[PDB]
Amino acid sequence: CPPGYFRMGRMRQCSRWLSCEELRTEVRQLKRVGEGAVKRVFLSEWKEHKVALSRLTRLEMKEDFLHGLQMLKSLQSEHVVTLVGYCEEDGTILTEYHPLGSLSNLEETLQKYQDVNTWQHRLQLAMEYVSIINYLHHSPLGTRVMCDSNDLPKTLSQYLLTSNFSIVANDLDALPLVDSGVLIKCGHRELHGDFVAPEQLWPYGEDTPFQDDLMPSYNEKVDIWKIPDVSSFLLGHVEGSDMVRFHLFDIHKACKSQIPAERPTAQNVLDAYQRVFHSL
Template sequence: MGAMKNCSAWLNCEALKKEVRKLKLVGEGAVKKVYLSEWKEMKVALSQLTLPALKEDFLHGLRMLQSLQSRHVVTLVGYCEDNYSILTEYHPLGSLKHLNATFNLPKYQNLNTWQNRFELAIDYVSIIRYLHNSPLGVLVMCDSNDLDKVLSQYLLTSDFHLVANDLDALPLVDKEKGVWVKCGPREIMGDFVAPEQLWPHGPGVEFHDDLMPPYDEKTDIWKIPAVTDYLLDHVEGSDIVRFHLFDIHAECKRQNPSMRPSAQTVLETYKRVLALLLKELAQSDSKESL
């Protein structure tokens, strides 16, 4: 983490109490409050449980953080189950919700290119691919009922990559054992979510969780085009990227979940498109220099 050269054991309750200093509140959700804090002159994020009733969600998020440590997930620094605290690496650029505001800052305006934005989309799909092929099995990103909610789950690093941050709602799919998922016991609505997440029995039948069919990880695939569209924004060259992604995005939006591609297939397509476009750009530049 940061400038650290050696691995360090996760901090325990005692170390969190003695070595970590809270600075200010920087975020608050249903499950936790997040404080910018300091540990050994490094900025860290201290998350603390907001409502005791949601402690199971909080602890599930901790278990996921422990099990999924990789380049795709925010670095866990320490935790204390006694007082429901989790310490992670701090990323000052914040969540993906603030991406456009970040690119509008004078120091980052020169980075606001279709190439960098497309690289972020590749990072996003890489994280989905990792969750669908995780050490724990096939995990579904359930905190994703609208675009804002999806964006809030990811942090933008200082070198403009993405890491998953909020892992409180990652249920497991195991088709061999007949285990499918439902993202919560309440009715999900809106154009953003996959069709199989919507109440199938019409407005004449009152919603009841027992009557709601479960689904699988292909709900994440349905949402990829909308997230990528946000990430690409309307910078010069982004429409060319969209044109090359049209076919794979049409496949992501198939009504039948089993007909949608895997995250691995989407990722391979994204990488192939990026390589093609960079090659075309290089050829174009060399012609102009002649």
């Protein structure tokens, strides 16, 4: 669809984005389905279509809410959830509903849908995830980083499983730009652990207390760092999974280089995933 238009369901053609009056008069809210530091999300209906209605939680998270909306408007593509309508005044966003929901439900979903509970389909799932990262790193709005991914469940929370079994990014609230000398930080609070990239950890030791003003900024390689965790989750433990992990060890090891500049690009990881896929 051209910029500003959407298509879903049995729509053969593209319709303009809905506005405040259409959301106020034509959408019937059905039941809560998610939440949400920024949005409260409701399964809803609009004509024959199930849609998601995301409502701003607190007029204080407002700034994060419009960022995701602006990201959503400019980043429409096969990799992002379809934007249907929005209303800034009401702090609402309308998008295509995906009844399989969060990527977290993958294992639950794959038991009906076991024509696709194979290693081949899971690895293709993993290739779609990397394709999104590659798209975000080369987006209409420049290189964008999927900042809100400090642990596996939270990272998966941000993507949806479509009924065809593609993946799309959904939550784009935290999407800083990397560029000029423009680097980024994922929040203002100290990050800990091994899921975040090591350059996201405080670098100055226990004898220097954390000060965000001293925390050095970083770039889109923090997304590369997290690829093997998402890929491994998607492969799961069905026949062939460990065979695929074996062939992915080294590309995944390059994804965990302590030195960010040594990690591959998303395009490199995708390329290697494809070669491994067709070889097996």
